[PDB]
Swiss-Prot record:
Belongs to the alkaline phosphatase family. It is found in: Periplasm. The gene is phoA. This is Alkaline phosphatase. Isozymes 1 and 3 are a dimer of identical chains, isozyme 2 is a dimer of heterogeneous chains, one of each of the subunits from isozymes 1 and 3.
């Protein structure tokens, strides 16, 4: 379940007087090599079949989560993005 970038979370926990589900939080584990983490360029990730490039920070490490507000939940309400950098053995 859930590819890279993309993570189909729901939001209906609560109640006021309508749909309380603005902004889907897509948390995907980002497999990132040591050279990739060192240089901090872009990494091409496949979100629901869409080829996009996400910019990774230079000197990023294992367990570092890249929070990008608005780029996550696609569609009508822009949601939060969480890419938890998982360093590949090199």
């Amino acid at each position: 379940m859930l590819p890279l970038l993309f993570t189909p979370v729901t939001k209906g926990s609560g109640g006021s007087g309508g749909s309380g589900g603005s902004g889907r939080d897509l948390r995907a584990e980002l497999p990132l090599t040591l050279e990739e983490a060192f240089h901090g360029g872009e990494r091409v990730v496949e979100v629901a079949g869409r080829r996009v490039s996400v910019r990774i920070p230079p000197g990023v490490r294992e367990g570092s989560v890249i929070r990008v507000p608005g780029m996550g939940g696609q569609g009508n309400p822009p949601g939060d993005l969480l890419l938890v950098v998982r360093l590949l053995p090199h």
